Structure 1
Amino acid sequence: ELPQMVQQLNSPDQQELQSALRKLSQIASGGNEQIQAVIDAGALPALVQLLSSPNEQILQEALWALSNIASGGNEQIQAVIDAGALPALVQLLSSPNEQILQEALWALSNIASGGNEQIQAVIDAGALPALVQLLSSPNEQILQEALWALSNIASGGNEQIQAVIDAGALPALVQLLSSPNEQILQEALWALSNIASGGNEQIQAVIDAGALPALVQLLSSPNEQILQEALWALSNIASGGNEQKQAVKEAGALEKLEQLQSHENEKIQKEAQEALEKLQ
């Protein structure tokens, strides 16, 4: 069953190829054991070759199959990297077709959802300059996928977070804190909070980029999901050294943090209390 479809991924017939791809995506979406059976059958080298396809439909389907395989365990994501998917994926970040671009970003965010080894592989493949460039995109759908991929890379160790900072992601993220789009604002806050989950040098970079006045202002948001995202970003900054804690106080956060201890939402109360306790 599986060897036949793996052979069919190399077929000259476009319909036999499209059907094999759709079948492979369906098996790969059914858990880690089914992902492992797809890897063991040797589907990855053929999937990787299809990332060079001129056909839009085949490309989107190959990217979707790879994003499903990459939704598995760290060793399964490593199998996608070892098959050489990353140079072809990073190249697809320059696509003028927004449907292909969305799928390429989604595949990359799945790979970047692994361990530090998998995240470092994404960084070493040159994904960060293409991602940072996409933060300037007028397409809100692409911007959200790019922000999600960036937030996964920034979920790694201090070395991975520093690579995000070194790529110039911070000025683009601080600019997005003024977005009237609440979904984009939420994603930009999430990317910033992950960067701020690093060490004092990574936290100071967030402070130096001028994130604090916008974060402090968003504590006045009537949108509770925006408020929570801003509270978590500030709480991560407050987990830094005395210099980082002093910057939060200087930015005028203390008054609003104490007031939010009495907010209607009991989770906001806890997050504001935790933030204020880190500072004092």
Structure 2
Amino acid sequence: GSELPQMVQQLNSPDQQELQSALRKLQQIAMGGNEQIQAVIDAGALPALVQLLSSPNEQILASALGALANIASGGNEQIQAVIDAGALPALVQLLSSPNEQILQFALIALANIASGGNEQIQAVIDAGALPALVQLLSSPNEQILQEALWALSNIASGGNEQIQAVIDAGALPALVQLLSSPNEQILQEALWALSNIASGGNEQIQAVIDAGALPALVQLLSSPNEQILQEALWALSNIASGGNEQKQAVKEAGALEKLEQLQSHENEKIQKEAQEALEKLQSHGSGGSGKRKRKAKITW
């Protein structure tokens, strides 16, 4: 209510303690759902938060990133408000920060923006985020790699043009190599990203096939880990939503026998997902692939 305007004014306070305190309060209010996010936006916070993305004060910067990430966990129009206030160029530049905490928070903010509609995703692409994000797939820092992967996965949850930008930026070879990761968190994210890419057109699905994903996906159908099994099933199921060449590549990789067997798994979600993938592979006709988006909040 009547304290938000003061909090917004304090984002320019010459008292650093008042400034920090207002920033933290806005960050926390924006954890409270879309009506609370709207009240923050309506109070005028966005221009000041964006401006603070240039601050050389790391405490300010980390809290500003948290506040913006939380705002961008709202509705597509709330995300669009962040984009319209100018946040993308500053966020993209922060992908080159040598400060791993700042980098992680920038990646989460960007990933949340890329969880909006196709226009919001396209704004992330147009700001030049893709080559940085693909380069971060090489990081030996698991925390950074994980947040980059979610940002890429979210971009690939757009339309065929957005998916094609992810392909054109060279993400597929790294994503396919990550299907061999012994790290289950990384593996899950690599599966989300590849499944979202395979939610596009037949030519996008074919690029996933051509990058070599099928042998690893078929091997994951033997996993005793029910979460990984469902993720591999989802990916195969999106691929099987293609045309005849795509369906035939899945058959040539040996999937049919395993999918048939997984119809007898005790877990009902696995049963159902295996049955659905099998029906698509044996059907004439196409479509029925699923896209998924991830939103995350930054709170301390």
TM-based fold match above 0.5: yes
Shorter-chain TM band: over 0.9
Deviation of the 1:39 alpha carbon = 1.3
TM-score (norm 1): 0.98
Deviation of the 1:30 alpha carbon = 1.6
Q: String of CA shifts for 1:150-197, please: whole Å, max 9, x gaps.
A: 111111111111111111010010010110101100110011001101
Deviation of the 1:264 alpha carbon = 2.5
TM-score (norm 2): 0.92
Structure 2 residue matching 1:262: 3-state secondary structure:
coil
Structure 1 residue matching 2:53: 3-state secondary structure:
helix
Structure 1 unmatched runs, 5+: none
Distance 2:126 2:222 in 1: 40
Deviation of the 1:138 alpha carbon = 0.5
Structure 2 residue matching 1:220: 3-state secondary structure:
coil
What percentage of residue pairs aligned between the two structures are identical?
A: 97
Distance 1:255 1:22 in 2: 55
Structure 2 residue matching 1:138: 3-state secondary structure:
coil
Deviation of the 1:24 alpha carbon = 0.9
Q: String of CA shifts for 1:251-278, please: whole Å, max 9, x gaps.
A: 1111111111112222211111111111
Distance 2:224 2:39 in 1: 48
Distance 2:227 2:177 in 1: 19
Deviation of the 1:12 alpha carbon = 2.4
Q: Would you identify which runs of 4 or more consecutive aligned residues in structure 1 move more than 4 Å?
A: none
Distance 1:278 1:26 in 2: 45
Higher-helix-fraction structure: 1
Deviation of the 1:99 alpha carbon = 0.9
The answer on 1:239 being equivalent to 2:241 is: yes
Deviation of the 1:220 alpha carbon = 0.8
* Larger relative contact order, structure 1 or 2 (CA cutoff 8 Å, min sep 6): 2
Aligned length: 280
Distance 2:172 2:190 in 1: 10
Distance 1:106 1:9 in 2: 22
Structure 2 unmatched runs, 5+: 283-300
Q: String of CA shifts for 1:63-114, please: whole Å, max 9, x gaps.
A: 0000111111111111100000000001111111111111101111111111
Deviation of the 1:238 alpha carbon = 0.3
Distance 1:34 1:183 in 2: 31
